[PDB]
Write an enzyme that holds these catalytic residues in place. Structure first.
Site, PDB file in Angstrom:
ATOM      1  N   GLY A 152       0.805  -1.133  -0.134  1.00 21.11           N
ATOM      2  CA  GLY A 152       0.149   0.160   0.019  1.00 21.11           C
ATOM      3  C   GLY A 152       0.750   1.342   0.159  1.00 21.11           C
ATOM      4  CE1 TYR A 210      10.490   3.536  -5.296  1.00 23.53           C
ATOM      5  CE2 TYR A 210      10.320   3.840  -7.851  1.00 23.53           C
ATOM      6  CZ  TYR A 210       9.596   3.868  -6.528  1.00 23.53           C
ATOM      7  OH  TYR A 210       8.169   4.406  -6.172  1.00 23.53           O
ATOM      8  CG  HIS A 248       6.050  12.456  -8.827  1.00 18.21           C
ATOM      9  ND1 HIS A 248       7.318  12.438  -9.402  1.00 18.21           N
ATOM     10  CD2 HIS A 248       5.680  11.897  -7.715  1.00 18.21           C
ATOM     11  CE1 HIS A 248       7.904  11.856  -8.412  1.00 18.21           C
ATOM     12  NE2 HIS A 248       6.871  11.432  -7.428  1.00 18.21           N
ATOM     13  CD  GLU A 280       5.794  11.090  -3.588  1.00 19.52           C
ATOM     14  OE1 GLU A 280       5.605   9.804  -3.339  1.00 19.52           O
ATOM     15  OE2 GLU A 280       6.493  11.532  -4.492  1.00 19.52           O
ATOM     16  CG  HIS A 293       9.820  14.943  -6.124  1.00 19.62           C
ATOM     17  ND1 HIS A 293       8.792  15.106  -5.388  1.00 19.62           N
ATOM     18  CD2 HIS A 293       9.768  13.331  -6.191  1.00 19.62           C
ATOM     19  CE1 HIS A 293       7.998  13.820  -5.165  1.00 19.62           C
ATOM     20  NE2 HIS A 293       9.068  13.024  -5.575  1.00 19.62           N
ATOM     21  CB  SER A 313      10.555   5.203  -2.055  1.00 21.53           C
ATOM     22  OG  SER A 313      10.063   6.445  -1.559  1.00 21.53           O
TER      23      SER A 313
HETATM   24  C1  MMK Z   1       6.430   6.090  -2.155  1.00 21.79           C
HETATM   25  C2  MMK Z   1       6.979   5.416  -3.423  1.00 21.79           C
HETATM   26  N1  MMK Z   1       6.079   5.659  -4.357  1.00 21.79           N
HETATM   27  C3  MMK Z   1       5.372   4.555  -5.203  1.00 21.79           C
HETATM   28  C4  MMK Z   1       3.870   4.672  -5.154  1.00 21.79           C
HETATM   29  N2  MMK Z   1       3.437   3.692  -5.978  1.00 21.79           N
HETATM   30  C5  MMK Z   1       3.738   2.274  -5.343  1.00 21.79           C
HETATM   31  C6  MMK Z   1       3.665   3.733  -7.319  1.00 21.79           C
HETATM   32  C7  MMK Z   1       6.301   6.878  -5.354  1.00 21.79           C
HETATM   33  O1  MMK Z   1       5.502   6.935  -6.283  1.00 21.79           O
HETATM   34  C8  MMK Z   1       7.095   8.012  -4.900  1.00 21.79           C
HETATM   35  N3  MMK Z   1       7.083   8.921  -6.182  1.00 21.79           N
HETATM   36  C9  MMK Z   1       7.872   8.691  -7.518  1.00 21.79           C
HETATM   37  C10 MMK Z   1       9.155   8.518  -7.078  1.00 21.79           C
HETATM   38  C11 MMK Z   1      10.099   7.700  -7.986  1.00 21.79           C
HETATM   39  C12 MMK Z   1      11.501   8.126  -7.769  1.00 21.79           C
HETATM   40  C13 MMK Z   1      12.385   7.237  -8.372  1.00 21.79           C
HETATM   41  O2  MMK Z   1      12.218   6.423  -9.223  1.00 21.79           O
HETATM   42  O3  MMK Z   1      13.654   6.906  -7.804  1.00 21.79           O
HETATM   43  C14 MMK Z   1      11.695   9.083  -7.149  1.00 21.79           C
HETATM   44  C15 MMK Z   1      10.945  10.016  -6.347  1.00 21.79           C
HETATM   45  N4  MMK Z   1       9.720   9.814  -6.630  1.00 21.79           N
HETATM   46 MN    MN Z   2       8.045  10.983  -5.931  1.00 20.58          MN
END
Ligand code: MMK
Ligand code: MN
Ligand code: NI
Ligand code: NI
Ligand code: NI
Ligand code: ZN
EC number: 1.14.11.66
Length: 337
Positions: free
Chosen positions: A152, A159, A170, A172, A258, A270
């Site tokens: 969730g 990553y 984007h 969050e 960011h 993350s």
């Molecule tokens: C809190 C982790 N999350 C996942 C949400 N869903 C599972 C996709 C994210 O979407 C956070 N936002 C995308 C992101 C991705 C990166 C990256 O790929 O490193 C860095 C900063 N932000």
């Molecule tokens: Mn992010």
């Protein structure tokens, strides 16, 4: 003035995650929308990363980018599952490895010059944690913030990056906070726009992608839009840069836009979290209207518990609270006395 701040907690300060988030907000870190936290030398979330080669990346994505003049759209092609070992071998091969570079500015130039070419593979959004089960400090798998009132939105994601893999502009989901720890490997570079200037970025994006704007009230949440720093400079959007190295945390703050990229083979963990301050952001978040599958949190439980005096007002559509992006979270009060 709303520049990215970096913090160096002692072990004693580091142990309590929420309290330290309140501390850095008391220092104004939230105004940049992005902050770095370097943990104490002695601290490690895992003894070794030599035992994860067999770990599976079920849905690697190849990042195809189309565009020009600093404006791009990124498309995901899902690839066959692979192991971390297989992904590493590809990442470090001659075809995909980091190019030669002296300063960051050179690598950044190469990134923006070459991001539509030789599309890389990103092992993103992998359910999991690389924290050993006993690490009680800043454990991204179990931060136990008020977000828990909701796999969730509070569960951990890995990553696995290679050179030139990107994350698009984007905020969050539900404009939550996020925490990012770079476990190992080459750096990850970030761009950020202060929350107090976020809608100026939205306005510009809307102007450059009017079709996308018409089809969705929050198309940036699709995480497909790449915009170069030169374009931000040209159109007067304030922003800041920072490079995250292995062993470092990045915090993103509510409504903090960011984007960025990876320098080479690396791995990051993350999740999202919340403070009391987030609740108003969550109430006012503009959500994706065009896909049924996107992340949506019922704010009722949060308003009932932490804003009981406003609950009936809010449910009648008359809560007109205006967010002041400069205000720290209430939990920071004790550091301002
Ligand atoms: C809190 C982790 N999350 C996942 C949400 N869903 C599972 C996709 C994210 O979407 C956070 N936002 C995308 C992101 C991705 C990166 C990256 O790929 O490193 C860095 C900063 N932000
Ligand atoms: Mn992010
Ligand atoms: Ni390794
Ligand atoms: Ni394939
Ligand atoms: Ni368009
Ligand atoms: Zn949408």
């Amino acid at each position: 003035s709303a520049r990215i701040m970096t913090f160096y907690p002692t072990m004693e300060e580091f142990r309590n995650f929420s309290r330290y988030i309140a501390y850095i907000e008391s220092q104004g870190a939230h105004r940049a929308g992005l902050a770095k936290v370097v943990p104490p030398k002695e601290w490690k979330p895992r003894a070794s990363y030599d035992d994860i080669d067999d770990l599976v990346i079920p849905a690697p994505i190849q990042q195809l980018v189309t565009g020009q003049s600093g404006l791009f759209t990124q498309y995901n092609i899902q690839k066959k599952a692979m192991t971390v070992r297989e992904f590493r071998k590809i990442a470090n091969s001659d075809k995909y490895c980091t190019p030669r570079y002296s300063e960051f500015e050179e690598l950044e130039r190469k990134y923006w010059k070459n991001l539509t070419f030789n599309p890389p593979i990103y092992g993103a959004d992998v359910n999991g944690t690389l924290y050993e089960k006993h690490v009680d400090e800043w454990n991204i798998g179990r931060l136990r913030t008020i977000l828990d009132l909701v796999e969730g939105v509070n569960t951990p994601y890995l990553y696995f990056g290679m050179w030139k893999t990107s994350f698009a502009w984007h905020t969050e989901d539900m404009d939550l906070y996020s925490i990012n720890y770079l476990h190992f490997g080459e750096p990850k570079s970030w761009y950020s726009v202060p929350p107090e200037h976020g809608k100026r970025l939205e306005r510009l994006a809307k102007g450059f992608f009017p079709g996308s704007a018409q089809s969705c009230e929050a198309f940036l949440r699709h995480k497909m839009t790449l915009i170069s720093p030169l374009m931000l400079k040209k159109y007067g959007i304030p922003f800041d840069k920072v490079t995250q190295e292995a062993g470092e945390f990045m915090i993103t703050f509510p409504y903090g836009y960011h984007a960025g990229f990876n320098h080479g083979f690396n791995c990051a963990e993350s999740t999202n979290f919340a403070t009391r301050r987030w609740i108003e952001y969550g109430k006012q978040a503009v959500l994706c209207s065009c896909r049924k599958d996107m992340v949506k949190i019922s704010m009722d439980v949060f308003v009932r518990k932490f804003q009981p005096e406003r609950y009936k007002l809010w449910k009648a559509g008359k809560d007109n609270t205006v967010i002041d992006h400069t205000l720290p979270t209430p939990e920071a009060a004790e550091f301002l006395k």
